[PDB]
RNA sequence: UGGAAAUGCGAAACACUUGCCAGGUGACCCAUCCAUCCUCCCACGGUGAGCUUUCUUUUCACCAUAAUCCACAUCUCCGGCCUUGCUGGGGCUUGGGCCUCUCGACUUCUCGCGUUACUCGGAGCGGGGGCUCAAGAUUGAAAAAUGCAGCUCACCCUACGUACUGUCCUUUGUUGUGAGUUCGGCGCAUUAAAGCAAAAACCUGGGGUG
RNA sequence: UCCCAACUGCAGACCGUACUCAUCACCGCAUCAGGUCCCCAAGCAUCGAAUGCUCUGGUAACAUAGAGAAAGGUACACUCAGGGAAGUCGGCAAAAUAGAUGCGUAAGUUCGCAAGAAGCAUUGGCUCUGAGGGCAAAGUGGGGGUCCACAGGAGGGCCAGUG
RNA sequence: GUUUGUGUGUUUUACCGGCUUAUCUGAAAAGGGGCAACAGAGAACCUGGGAUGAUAUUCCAAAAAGAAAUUGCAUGUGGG
């Protein structure tokens, strides 16, 4: 995963042509925006809610993003009962 | 035991080229991994070796393929493999002698006429 | 801390392996290990490796000059001999 | 001890080295002694100074 | 660069690889290689041949 | 005897599909077993009962 | 040992299939002198060796 | 102000007046008491301090301390007063240790 | 293609050839202690579990992977606009520069020694590379992992949910690496090759033939 | 010149793979106390992969067994009075030897040893003490707290407030 | 019109640069054959998995397993 560091630079990524996926992580502080691209998951690390939102807003419709999320249930099963 | 401690490759031995080094895991366990090959390489030149380079990089044989030239680039001729002083020397030595050689010819050149 | 009355290194063999030998040996221990002059760099630091294999610490020069001590009289003499003779040979 | 002293000036170099060797042929026989020693010697230099 | 090598059989202590220029058009440094005949009697040579084209059979010991 | 490749060519053509990946081995059972993930474009169970596999 | 060539892989395979009760359906036929699965290999007796 | 504090929710058994027909009083007295002593026979200590509310006990101290002592203090204690019943303790907050009925 | 220099770089492009590269590029014993990494134990705290009836601070548990950057601030300059510049760890290597140690001295050491005017040492600089770190960042926590617990249709299901918590830090004692054949051994001297970097080379691109 | 970089897209053979690896899977003909190379290795005592118990793990071992307390045996079982090798080919056997510490140590010797030569002496527990290190700030005074300092906080949030 | 700047023509040619048909030149010995290492030398993955009955640094895919690494080869664009 390669980490991305300035907002603009990131925007270019989000439109990388490939840049499959992004994803939003929230933790205390912060929220990581993780982009799924080739060779890596290029990732820009967003603390700030204010800016965060706006940049989050900026998401071109086309944006694939999930936010980091909780117990999905892994979904294995054993095939009796 | 109390650890352990298992083997992550089949050849179990210690071996020269072989090393492993220990880690605490995310599963929080102690664990071997292999710890690669030594700094054998980028010595000086000179006389059974035996010193090392400057700037340009010191590693070992599998690494170099990788190793970048621009990290492998501080330089003067014959001494991309060298750091100053030996090179200074070898310059110097030619230069002068080759003056005296010329001088020698020149000495003899007057004696003839 | 104690350094024996008369045998140096020989302390290793204790009593084993007899006095006359101890004599014979003692002699060479002194010659071979000693630090001995450098030629050009002129200090004594020419140390044996292997079997009389002598590099100068500190001018990093290696001189082949054999056995237990480097350059025999004979050799030297010879060295003169040649000095002379060759010299004469030119002279 | 020596070194720090040296940088402190507490030791002068000649003396520093001397103790170094002296240390090396130890006659300092405990720390306590040595440090003491050093004050005293410094007295001799001061005496020397006063004298001078 | 580009030369001709200069190390083989060991006689006394020059330090290695040295530019000895040889045959009778050798000068006569120690180790230098001159024909024995054209080396002067009483001189002390080492490794003389015998076969000639053997580079020192005789005295090939230490 | 099959090398992986060949198998890959064959099935895709034969079954109108593409496979994300194959692990194979031969057990001394004597047979090569191919573990094939069919792609998302296909469902191995479904596909099973295209064969009419149970 | 750990590894053991394909040929080798073959020898067990071929054998194993023989190391079990003769096909019974056969046994039933007319005039079946048939004692048993004679030649069956085993291991705590009969290592195959080598 | 500087201290370490834990609040002991003793809610369920106190409520049933388990300390011999009480509301937490008797337990308060007992609790301040067993802590180790010397000085020879009849000398007492003065560095830890205790408040009981309507439905809490709070334990505050200037000095830092083992959480370890409480776990004994209660375990050895319930077993000591015959108050063992159906309660079990868990760490509710990193500052509140809770007692519970279950089933 | 930068800086007196040690020594520089997105790319300064330049491949055959070299009686080419004492080029750790493979390559090498043990050996030494020592140093420290690693790991490891102790123990402090602190959490969480579990223990624990006449007595106690008991027990256990308390984590983080490869993989990658190294841009935070000092300082520039605390943010007008921050623009010189991007200056900035430790602690082993060497080098480099200035000064030039001499009445000798320094000098570094556990070790056997050494050094210095063949330039010590001292300062300042350059770099070598175990290591460790550095805003530690990425990784990374996120169902991380771990432990709980509260509830839950239901809790004897279920799906095993659902929801919640907590999930930590100084600190003691073992070992890779420190590169040599690094302490000794030594009538002893510690495979090889494929395998790699570099050089020299320098023919191309900065050209109108004729 | 276009490939002296970049990124990106698109695809990855082959061959191994269980498990055993030994007081039952190996090998002793044999479900054998014999043998058979390699990695890992806690806590405590302590000289310490010792001895020893132990954690962690694993055993809960199995190895026909019970039932039994006689003869004979065997046992890596003891003990013996007085006595002290008479015994015995023979001190075999067995027994006497100890750690450490301190003290101490004859001949001879190839000088190196011989040497734990010899031989003494000491060794608990308790309860104080001593000696033996690292880590800061040379170092200081005066004046100000009738506040002297700022970006930090609390409380004043029933007033017709303001954001 | 100049001179200059810019853009274009499958212009033309000269000249480079390239690339392939193509033609000539053009290497020597313990090495004129090839094997020989299930530990030397020794070229790309890590951890995690409400994960198997019995296998996995191989099973877990796109999103929550993930994150990697490398090769090969394409492609466009970028550097050009």
In sequence order, what DSSP letters do the residues of F16-43 get, joined into one string?
T--EEEEEEEEETTTEEEEEEEEPTTS-
| Alpha-carbon span A78 to B17, nearest angstrom | 45
Per-residue HEC secondary structure of C33-88 comes to HCCEECCCCCCEEEEEECCCEEEECCCCCEEECCCCCCCCHHHHHHHHHHHHHHHH
| CB A68 within 8 Å of CB A24 | yes
| Cβ neighbours of B61 (radius 10 Å) | 9
| Cβ neighbours of A14 (radius 10 Å) | 21
Tokens, residue B97: 């002698």
| Alpha-carbon span H83 to H77, nearest angstrom | 8
Report helix angle D13-24 to D31-51, nearest 10: 150
C-chain CB neighbours of E44 within 8 Å are: 78, 81-82
Closest CA to C53 of C32, C29, C27: C32
Tokens, residue C3: 């350094």
Answer whether G touches F (≥3 Cβ pairs < 8 Å). yes
**β-pairing verdict for H49-52 and H88-93:** unpaired
B-chain CB neighbours of C62 within 8 Å are: 47
Hey, which bits of chain A come out as E strands? Answer: 2-4, 21-27, 30-36, 41-46, 65-67
**β-pairing verdict for F31-38 and H4-9:** unpaired
| Cβ neighbours of C75 (radius 10 Å) | 17
| CB H74 within 8 Å of CB H34 | no
| Alpha-carbon span C39 to C61, nearest angstrom | 9
| Alpha-carbon span F4 to F28, nearest angstrom | 18
Closest CA to H101 of H22, H18, H26: H18
| Alpha-carbon span G23 to A77, nearest angstrom | 38
Residue with tokens 């610490």: C57
Q: Measured between CA atoms, how close is C58 to chain B, in angstroms?
A: 13
Nucleotide nearest to H63 (CA to C1'): I45
C-alpha torsion angle, residues G38, G39, G43, G45 (rounded to 10): 60
CB contact under 8 A, G12 and F28: yes
Experiment used for this model: cryo-EM
| Alpha-carbon span C40 to E17, nearest angstrom | 19
Closest-approach residue (CA) in chain G for F1: G6
Closest CA to A30 of A14, A10, A52: A52
A26 pairs with which residues across the strands? A31
| Alpha-carbon span A59 to A52, nearest angstrom | 11
Buried-state track E19-48, b at ≥16 Cβ within 10 A, e below 16: eeeeeeebebebbbbbeeeebeeeeebebb
A2 pairs with which residues across the strands? A42
Report helix angle H25-33 to H68-81, nearest 10: 120
G-chain CB neighbours of F26 within 8 Å are: 9
Resolution in Å, one decimal place: 5.6
> C16 a known binding residue?
no
Closest CA to H8 of H26, H27, H21: H27
| Alpha-carbon span A7 to C29, nearest angstrom | 76
Would the CA dihedral through D34, D35, D38, D39 be positive or negative? negative
| CB E30 within 8 Å of CB E14 | yes
H100 pairs with which residues across the strands? H88
Measured CA B78 to C1' I21 distance, in angstroms: 8
| Cβ neighbours of D32 (radius 10 Å) | 9
Residue H100: HSE in the Cβ half-sphere, 13 Å Cα cutoff: 9
Would the CA dihedral through H77, H80, H81, H86 be positive or negative? positive
H59 pairs with which residues across the strands? H6, H50
Residue with tokens 């023989």: G18
Q: What does residue D19 show for φ and ψ, rounded to 5 degrees? A: -65, -25
Closest CA to A27 of A52, A8, A9: A52
**In chain D, which residues from 1 to 52 place their CB closer than 7 Å to nucleic acid strand J?**
1, 30-32
Residue with tokens 């603009």: A8
Helix (H) or strand (E) holding D50: helix D31-51
Which residues in chain C (48-77) have CB-CB distances under 8 A to chain E? 54, 61-66, 71, 75
* Strand K contact at CB of residue B59, distance < 7 A: no
| Alpha-carbon span B20 to B14, nearest angstrom | 8
Tokens, residue F35: 């573990």
> C79 a known binding residue?
no
Helix (H) or strand (E) holding A58: helix A49-58
| CB H87 within 8 Å of CB H13 | yes
Q: Measured between CA atoms, how close is F25 to chain G, in angstroms?
A: 12
Which residues contact residue C8 at a Cβ distance below 8 angstroms, ignoring those fewer than 6 apart?
C26, C29, C30
Tokens, residue H91: 């760490």
CA G48 and chain centroid, separation: 11
Measured CA B72 to C1' J4 distance, in angstroms: 17
**Measured CA angle at C28 (ends C26, C31), to 5 deg:** 120
Closest CA to F22 of F32, F30, A75: F32
| Alpha-carbon span H47 to H35, nearest angstrom | 11
Q: How many residues does chain G have?
A: 50
Q: How many residues does chain D have?
A: 52
Closest CA to H27 of H37, H16, H38: H16
F23 pairs with which residues across the strands? F35
Tokens, residue F32: 């090569």
| CB H99 within 8 Å of CB H9 | yes
Q: Residue C17: left (phi > 0), alpha (psi -120 to 50), or beta? A: left
CA H99 and chain centroid, separation: 11
| Alpha-carbon span E12 to C66, nearest angstrom | 8
Q: DSSP for A38-55?
A: SSSEEEEEE--HHHHHHH
Tokens, residue B87: 């090179």
| CB G41 within 8 Å of CB G5 | no
Which residues contact residue E62 at a Cβ distance below 8 angstroms, ignoring those fewer than 6 apart?
C66
Which of E12, E43, E62 is the closest to C85 by Cβ?
Answer: E43
Would the CA dihedral through G5, G6, G12, G15 be positive or negative? negative
Closest CA to B25 of B33, B35, B37: B33
Give the CA distances from residue B73 to residues B44, B59, B70, C63, D13, in Å, rounded to whole numbers and listed in that order: 16, 14, 5, 36, 44
Buried-state track H11-39, b at ≥16 Cβ within 10 A, e below 16: eebbeeebbeeeebebbbeebeeeeeeee
Q: What does residue C71 show for φ and ψ, rounded to 5 degrees? A: 20, 85
Q: What does residue B43 show for φ and ψ, rounded to 5 degrees? A: -90, 170
Give the CA distances from residue B110 to residues B97, B100, B104, B105, in Å, rounded to whole numbers and listed in that order: 20, 15, 11, 9
């Amino acid at each position: 995963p390669r980490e991305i560091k300035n907002l603009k630079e990131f925007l270019a990524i989000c439109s990388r042509k490939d840049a499959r996926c992004v994803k939003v992580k929230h933790n205390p502080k912060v929220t990581k925006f993780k982009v799924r691209c080739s060779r890596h998951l290029y990732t820009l690390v967003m603390a700030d809610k204010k800016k965060a939102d706006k940049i989050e807003r900026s998401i071109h419709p086309s944006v694939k993003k999930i936010t980091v999320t909780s117990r999905s249930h892994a979904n294995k099963n054993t095939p009796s009962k | 035991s109390c650890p352990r401690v298992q083997y992550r490759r089949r050849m179990h031995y210690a071996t020269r080229g072989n090393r492993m080094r220990l880690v605490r895991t995310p599963g929080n366990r102690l664990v071997m991994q292999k710890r690669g090959k030594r700094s054998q390489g980028p010595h000086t030149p000179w006389v059974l070796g035996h010193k090392r380079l400057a700037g340009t990089k010191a590693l070992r044989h599998t690494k170099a393929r990788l190793a970048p030239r621009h990290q492998k680039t501080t330089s003067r001729p014959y001494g991309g493999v060298l750091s100053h002083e030996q090179v200074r020397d070898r310059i110097v030595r030619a230069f002068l002698i080759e003056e005296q050689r010329i001088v020698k010819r020149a000495l003899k050149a007057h004696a003839k006429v | 801390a104690k350094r024996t009355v008369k045998m140096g290194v020989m302390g290793r063999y204790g009593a084993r392996y007899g006095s006359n030998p101890r004599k014979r040996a003692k002699k060479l221990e002194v010659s071979q290990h000693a630090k001995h002059f450098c030629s050009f760099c002129g200090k004594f630091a020419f140390r044996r490796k292997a079997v009389g294999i002598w590099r100068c610490d500190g001018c990093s020069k290696t001189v082949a000059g054999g056995a237990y001590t480097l350059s025999t009289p004979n050799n030297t003499t010879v060295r003169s001999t040649v000095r002379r003779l060759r010299e004469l040979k030119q002279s | 001890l020596l070194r720090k002293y040296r940088e402190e000036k507490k030791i002068d170099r000649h003396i520093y080295r001397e103790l170094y060797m002296k240390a090396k042929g130890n006659v300092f026989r405990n720390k306590r002694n040595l440090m003491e020693h050093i004050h005293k010697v410094k007295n001799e230099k001061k005496k020397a100074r006063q004298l001078a | 660069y580009r030369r001709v090598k200069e190390l083989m059989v060991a006689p006394e202590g020059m330090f290695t690889g040295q530019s000895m220029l040889c045959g009778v058009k050798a000068p006569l440094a120690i180790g230098n290689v001159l024909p024995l005949g054209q080396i002067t009697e009483g001189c002390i040579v080492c490794n003389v041949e015998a076969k000639v084209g053997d580079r020192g059979t005789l005295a090939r010991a230490s | 005897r099959a090398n992986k490749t060949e198998i890959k060519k064959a099935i895709r053509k034969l079954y109108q599909v593409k496979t994300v990946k194959v692990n194979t081995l031969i057990r001394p059972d004597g047979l090569k077993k191919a573990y094939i993930r069919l792609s998302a474009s296909y469902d191995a169970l479904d596909t099973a009962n295209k064969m009419g596999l149970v | 040992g750990r590894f053991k060539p394909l040929a080798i892989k073959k020898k067990y395979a071929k054998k194993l299939k023989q190391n079990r009760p003769v096909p019974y359906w056969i046994r039933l036929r007319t005039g079946n002198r048939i004692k048993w699965n004679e030649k069956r290999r085993h291991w705590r007796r009969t290592k195959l060796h080598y | 102000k500087g201290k370490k504090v834990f609040k002991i929710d003793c809610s369920i058994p106190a409520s049933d007046g388990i300390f011999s027909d009480d509301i937490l009083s008797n337990f308060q007295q007992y609790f301040q008491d067993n802590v180790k002593l010397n000085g020879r026979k009849g000398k007492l200590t003065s560095k830890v301090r205790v408040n009981m509310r309507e439905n809490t006990l709070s334990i505050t101290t200037t000095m830092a301390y083992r959480k370890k002592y409480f776990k004994y203090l209660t375990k050895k204690f319930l077993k000591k007063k015959d108050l063992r019943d159906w309660i079990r303790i868990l760490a509710k907050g990193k500052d509140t240790y809770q007692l519970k009925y279950f089933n």
